[PDB]
Amino acid sequence: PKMKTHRGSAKRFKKTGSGKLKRSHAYTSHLFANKSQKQKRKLRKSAVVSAGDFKRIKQMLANI
Amino acid sequence: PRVKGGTVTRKRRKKVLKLAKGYFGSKHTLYKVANQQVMKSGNYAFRDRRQKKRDFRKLWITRINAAARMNGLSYSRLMHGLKLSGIEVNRKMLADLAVNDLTAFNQLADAAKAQLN
Amino acid sequence: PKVALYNQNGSTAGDIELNASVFGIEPNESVVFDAILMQRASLRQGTHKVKNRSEVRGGGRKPWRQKGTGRARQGSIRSPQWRGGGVVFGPTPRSYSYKLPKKVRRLAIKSVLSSKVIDNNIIVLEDLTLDTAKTKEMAAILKGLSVEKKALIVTADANEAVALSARNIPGVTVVEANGINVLDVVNHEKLLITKAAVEKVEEVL
Amino acid sequence: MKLHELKPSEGSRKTRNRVGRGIGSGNGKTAGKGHKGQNARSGGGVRPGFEGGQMPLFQRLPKRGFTNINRKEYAVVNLDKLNGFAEGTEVTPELLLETGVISKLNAGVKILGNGKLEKKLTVKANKFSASAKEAVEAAGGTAEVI
RNA sequence: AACAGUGGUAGGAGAGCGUUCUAAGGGCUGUGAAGCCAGACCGGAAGGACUGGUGGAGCGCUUAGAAGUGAGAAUGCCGGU
RNA sequence: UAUCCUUGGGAGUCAGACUGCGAGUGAUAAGAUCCGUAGUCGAAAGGGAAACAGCCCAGACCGCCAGCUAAGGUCCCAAAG
RNA sequence: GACCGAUAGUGAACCAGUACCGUGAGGGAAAGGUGAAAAGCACCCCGGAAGGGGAGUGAAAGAGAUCCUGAAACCGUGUGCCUACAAGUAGUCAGAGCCCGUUAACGGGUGAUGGCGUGCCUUUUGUAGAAUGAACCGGCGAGUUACGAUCUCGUGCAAGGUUAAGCAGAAGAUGCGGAGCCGCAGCGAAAGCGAGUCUGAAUAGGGCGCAUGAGUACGUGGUCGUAGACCCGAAACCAGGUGA
RNA sequence: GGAACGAGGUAGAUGAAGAGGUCUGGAAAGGCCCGCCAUAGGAGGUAACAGCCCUGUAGUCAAAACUUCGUUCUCUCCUGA
């Protein structure tokens, strides 16, 4: 049996040329009056998965 | 393919039992109780190889001390005089003399006794 | 490679220059090793299987209640601890086959042929012709060629006379140019070819 | 080689690590699973992204975007691979597939200027880049389109 | 050669021993195979020989390969005592 | 004085104990409990502390019937005043 | 058949789904080997027989009806050394005496007496442990296989590597088969652009990328994933049946 | 529905070559020295390991009767631009 890809993480992440994983931030859904515009401009931007998490999950994304 | 393992186990265990001769009954007749004594005998043997060096030392020393007490000295005072002289032979030799050739022992003790003064 | 030629009689004649690309090349023994194991494995048959604790007959009931007895917990009389027992992992039918890449396998066969021409256990022999299909004639030929051991024989289009002969001999095998292996080559210690078959193998290689 | 002098290339082969086969091995009595716990059991473990009830990473993160049905992943040439061709010769995706330059045509062909040229060519493709076609006509070629 | 070092659980790494089978090559065996019992032999270890006895027909060695590959414990299973 | 950093593969661990020092809770009681800090044990044999995981001394490749010392000791058990 | 070889392998190599258990459905065993050939022990004795000792057959009777070998636990016979004022996880080291004489080497068996010394495994902060497990001997008995991913090592070819199914081919190797797959260019949610791209009003800055390039196929090994997935072990749940 | 023909299955037949000699041995398939057949060296058995001892193998042949397939013929039925 072929490995099954983890579909939620597939919907959330994207792969890079250097093998890193692009991601979005949290705290960016619905409750913004309790946050500074500084946070918000920082958080609409993208991010990158950390090493520990990457170690945890990368086997779930070999098939991208 | 399948593998039984008939001969190896028997051969190994018998080797152990041949090592375990002379032991009291079941400890030479039975494999595993013998194994756990043989092994124990190994630790005891290691220990005793190093206790010999500690025991014969004592024995030599007692002999030397007796001979020096009849010569009119103590072991400690003697060996101090000897190291002070240069007579660093060793205790095993001294004991062998004190048993066999006590005159030589007296020669040495007289040297040390003189050089203590 | 400018090796001698021989007749079916065993008499020498003018030599033959061979395709150095196929024969005049340095071998690669790691490659040959890999190919040999591959073929040696592919010839397996995989008819090895045993009975799991599920496949074995019976079991089912808890032979005795979990508690109250002085005996040990046991779930079935067919678990591996037991005399009858089901095997834990054991064998099971499969295939040991695998395939290499084409460049590698052709390099392998080229290499071993190069080695044969090096150590001079190779013989070219045009025009194998047998009025009969007999073995006495073949063995006489091999005697005339001083072939006292295993041997491989090659044709282009399956001389059935030569195949009917030469099989009753133990150490001898026969094949066409299309059916060449590395394993047969290695195993049979000496090689007999028709120059026709030479042109075939060297043009497909 | 010979069957009775075989040997592999060093480093190609290794012995497998058996476990539960004594303590001199260093893998006896536990097979390197250590002592008790959910990871030491038969079938023992957890699913990979699991974190012990902590809300795992992907769930705490949001989804983003979608996929188009009508996407085009054109096959890309980067304009240095063209120097392998002869001067003045036409070029087509068919020709590239023939040469093996392109192992797959995916909706068309695009050319890109990660290189340079020393050749004029009568190129025709599905789509071009600005730098690419300029480099072509600068070398003296042309920029036809399919 | 010199220098330095060499306690060790979990655990990581590396070197190997041994068992069954297969391929090839070279062998042993009714002038006595394997197996079994002795022995004061050899090797750093796993282990390996030699001699004698029993037994009365199959078995090692080398290089590789593949594994139902090594048991002292499961209130383990079976059998025997 | 040689270990430091990065990347990658593989793990195990998340019940800790005592002792000394500084603190808390406690009754300035607990071989208590909880923290910090250093050590030892754990995972470390050996000598002493009678015996005696955690104290004192000290770190085991192997052998030797050689010697110098540490802690602790020198009337006999038991080597040494 | 790089499948088993009588605890294995069909439960079952033998009169087995038998014996046996159960009201019943149902459960469910054990147990192979004389010898080349019966030539299977005429006859003599002991004995009521059985069972022996001779003789004889046979290569072999130490082969004699559980009939190839025949281990260990266990059971006994005889004897070289030791032992009835001694306490001892039962040994080790030292060591006298006595008895022997080897795979001939600072040899062997016993061992009065002295010294040191609280078993093995598990689990524990820590166990001689008055915590667990094992009566003993023997056998069997636990990290594997497929598929896929990833890392390392190796090999081959390299900006190119590779075939799958399938056809032919001895269940094979091989050839054909390039459909497909990975990589060579990425960025962006996407249109799309392109060694740049996205954001953005922005030729700004910043992120990701290139310039600082090597992958790919196969194999070994490690690890992971999905499958009973290191082995044994529940109480229990469901379906269908058997039983007043 | 029927015949004919061909092939095959359901019993089978044939089928080359050495007691070769000599040493052990209880007995040779074994050892040594020699020969032979092979479209047959596949297997099993025979007092121990057999190409040439037996049954057999390769190859070539074979069926009264019942069956399987195939070909042809009879037999049937036929219109479409």
Protein architecture, described:
This is part of a larger assembly, with chains A (64 residues), B (117 residues), C (205 residues) and D (146 residues). Chain A is of the alpha+beta class and 64 residues long. In chain A, 31% of the residues lie in helices and 14% in strands. Chain A is built from three helices and three strands; from the N terminus they run αββαβα. Chain A has helices spanning 7-12, 37-43, 51-57, and strands at 14-15, 21-24, 46-48. In chain A, a hairpin with a 5-residue loop joins β1 and β2. Chain A is elongated and about 50 Å long. In chain A, 11% of the residues are buried. With 117 residues, chain B is mostly helical. Chain B has one domain (1-117). Helices cover 79% and strands 0% of the residues of chain B. The longest helix of chain B has 41 residues, at 31-71. In chain C, 24% of the residues are buried. In chain C, β4 (151-155), α4 and β5 form a beta-alpha-beta unit. Chain C is elongated and about 95 Å long. With 205 residues, chain C is α/β, with parallel strands linked by helices. Chain D is α/β, with parallel strands linked by helices and 146 residues long. Chain D has a domain at 75-145: Ribosomal Protein L15, Chain: K, domain 2, CATH 3.100.10.10. In chain D, the strands form two sheets. Chain D has a three-stranded parallel sheet with strand order 1-3-5. A three-stranded parallel sheet of chain D has the order 2-4-6. The radius of gyration of chain D is 29 Å and the shape is elongated. The two termini of chain D are 56 Å apart. Chains in contact: A-D, C-D. Chain A binds chain D through residues 6, 8-9, 11-13, 23-26, 28-29, 49, 53, 56-57, 59-60, and chain D through 48-49, 51, 57-64. Chain C binds four RNA strands through α1, α2, α3, α4 and α5. Chain B: It holds the Pfam family Ribosomal_L20. Chain B: Keywords: Ribonucleoprotein, Ribosomal protein, RNA-binding, rRNA-binding. Chain B: One of its GO terms (molecular function) is rRNA binding. Chain B: InterPro entries: Ribosomal_bL20, RIBOSOMAL_L20_CS, Ribosomal_protein_bL20_C. Chain B: One of its GO terms (biological process) is translation.
